[PDB]
Every structure is written in C-alpha cells, then in structure tokens.
Design a protein around this ligand. Structure first.
Ligand SMILES: *Cc1c(C)c(=O)n2c(=O)c(C)c(C)n12
Ligand SMILES: [Cl-]
Ligand SMILES: [Cl-]
Ligand SMILES: [Cl-]
Ligand SMILES: [Cu+2]
Ligand SMILES: [Cu+2]
Ligand SMILES: [Cu+2]
Ligand SMILES: [Cu+2]
Ligand SMILES: [Mg+2]
Ligand SMILES: [Mg+2]
Ligand SMILES: [Mg+2]
Length: 310
C-alpha cells in the first residue's frame, strides 16, 4: 500500500472567459475595479494573443501531468493534485479545504514560479499553511524555490542553444540575450528578499550552459503603485543596449514565467517586439515550458528532492 499525499499546485490564476476579466483585475488591484477604457483595452489584448481560454487551461494541464508523472516514476507515494490560485477561484484556501474534506493529512506544495519572493511565493505558502492550521489534522511541506534545479536550467539552455543555432551568421555574432521575470515593488529589499539575486543566478546559469557570453537581466510587467518597482523594464533595457552597442538580434527568456500568458504573449511578443521592430533588430522568444514532458519531469524531481526521496 502506497502513502496518499496531496500535491498542492499554486499559481496566480487566469480569467476563464472574457466576462471574468473585470473580477480578475479587480482582485489584482486590491478591490479597485478597472475603468471602462481599461476593461476594453484588456479584452483587446487577450483577443490579439489568440484568446483567454487556452491560457487558462495550461495550469490545469501542468498540475494533472505532474500528478500522473510523479505517480509513474516512483512507487511509494500516490499523489492527488489540487489547484490553488491567488486571484480567482479555486482560491488557495478552497484547495486546502478540499484536501481536508477528502481526507488528506499530508501534502507537499509547489508554486508555478521558480524564484522565491516575499510578495508572491511566501504569501501563497503562508496562506496554505494557515488554512491547514485552522482546519487541523493536515500538514504541508512547501517548496520555496526551484530556479536552480538542473533539469529546469537545461530546459532553457537547450531552447537558447536552438535559437542561436537558427540565427543567420551576422545575427549570431551580434545578439543580446535578455533574461527576465515579473517586476515587484523595490521595497521587498527591506526584508532581504532574494528574488532579484535568484533572477540574476538563473540568468548566469542559462547563459553559461548555452555558451552565451553577452546577456542582461531585466524585469517586466510592473503593476501601478506610487512606490518604485524593480527595473530596468525590458522595453527600456532593449533600447538602451541597442543605443550602446547596436545589437542586431534580441533573444527574450522570461524565465520567471512558466506558461504562455498575457505577460509573455503581449508583454514580450508585442511590447518588446515593437521596440525591436523600431530599431531594426530581429526578435526571438523561445517556447515556454507549458506542460511539456521535459518540464514536468523537472517539476517532479523538485518535489521528490523536497521530500528527500531522490
Ligand atoms: C499573475 C502573476 C504571475 C504569473 C506572476 O508571476 N505574478 C507576479 O509576480 C504578480 C505580482 C502577479 C499578480 N503575478
Ligand atoms: Cl515560504
Ligand atoms: Cl525549497
Ligand atoms: Cl529559496
Ligand atoms: Cu483538475
Ligand atoms: Cu511521465
Ligand atoms: Cu543585473
Ligand atoms: Cu502582472
Ligand atoms: Mg461570452
Ligand atoms: Mg533551494
Ligand atoms: Mg505593462
């Protein structure tokens, strides 16, 4: 008989249909409903990148593929996946309550974002643990970061190598690699938040494995509050590096994101591409991990290492 464990997979969440945009963004904006022009802009952006519902399905597929792969590659534990989201149902607390109702007493959790921060990962883990404590009789051990898992580094190294090999000769000799994650308010530094250092380490490990000597670290998708957010933003960084040294190709690796999403398909493949098109450079942005088997195997290894079983 195998031990049963819950597998709590946590993520930001996505609207499921266009009519969910209002409530999703109201939640992100801490109760402030977007004005009508912004609502219309957001709908247009989702239409421009091919629609909402495919983006919403990816998290579901990642959690289910991870459950099935973990159950196939070892014989001691039977995992059952539960999805808990920050900004739309099923919420984190809903998922923990469901695990408790179903009779789970032991769970492991992972956030679908490879870098730890106080703003995101630590808050998701704290919310899950506090719900478990309120209900009693259920314990959660939480993955905090996994950007340094070799199988995850290798996913991106191989995609970068393929992109550079695909380039014409003069591009390959005059290209710049930009490695990025979602910006956060700068005030996280008051806590010693390692998020910026972990993004810089991801960039070092990917550029090193791919043999790319010219690379830079940037941030993207900052929200709107009066206090400053981490920078430079990818759009400004691209133009600055072009003005400095005249690169003919820019390769974007938004390593902080794990799936196709508005903040990649729009904030890179539209907003960064506007800049590259303006300066006359080529744009490349390799495939996101999504639910591909190589990435699922990386996540399964993260989980089993956290449990001491590999
Ligand atoms: C929704 C979302 C994703 C995918 C992400 O990485 N982040 C952040 O870092 C914030 C603050 C939010 C919201 N999201
Ligand atoms: Cl934590
Ligand atoms: Cl960890
Ligand atoms: Cl960490
Ligand atoms: Cu499901
Ligand atoms: Cu498998
Ligand atoms: Cu830097
Ligand atoms: Cu965002
Ligand atoms: Mg409709
Ligand atoms: Mg670690
Ligand atoms: Mg923006």
């Amino acid at each position: 008989s195998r031990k049963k464990m819950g597998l709590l997979v946590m993520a930001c969440g996505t609207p499921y249909k266009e009519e969910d945009i209002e409530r999703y963004y109201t939640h992100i904006r801490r109760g402030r409903k977007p004005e009508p022009e912004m609502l219309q802009d957001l709908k247009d952006r989702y239409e421009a990148i091919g629609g909402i519902s495919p983006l919403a399905q990816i998290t579901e597929q990642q959690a289910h593929n991870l459950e099935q792969h973990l159950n196939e590659i070892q014989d001691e534990i039977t995992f059952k996946a539960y999805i808990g989201l920050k900004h739309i149902e099923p919420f984190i607390e809903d998922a923990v309550a469901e695990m408790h109702k179903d009779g789970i007493t032991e769970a492991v959790s992972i956030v679908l974002a490879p870098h730890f921060s106080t703003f995101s990962v630590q808050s998701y883990n704290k919310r899950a643990k506090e719900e478990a404590e309120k209900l009693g009789g259920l314990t959660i051990t939480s993955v905090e970061s996994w950007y340094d898992e070799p199988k995850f580094v290798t996913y991106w190294v191989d995609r970068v190598k393929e992109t550079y090999a695909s380039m014409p000769e003069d591009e390959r000799e005059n290209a710049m690699l930009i490695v990025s994650a979602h910006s956060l308010p700068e005030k996280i530094k008051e806590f010693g938040d390692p998020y910026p250092d972990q993004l810089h380490e991801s960039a070092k490990l990917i550029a090193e494995g791919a043999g790319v000597s010219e690379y830079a670290v940037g941030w993207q998708s900052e929200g709107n509050t009066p206090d400053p957010w981490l920078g430079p933003d990818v759009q400004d960084l691209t133009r600055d590096l072009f003005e400095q040294k005249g690169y003919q190709a820019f390769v974007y690796v938004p390593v902080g994101f794990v799936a196709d999403h508005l903040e990649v398909l729009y904030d890179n493949d539209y907003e960064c591409k506007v800049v590259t098109d303006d300066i006359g450079a080529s744009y490349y942005r390799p495939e996101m991990p999504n639910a591909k088997p190589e990435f699922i195997d990386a996540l399964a290894t993260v989980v089993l290492k956290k449990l001491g079983r590999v």
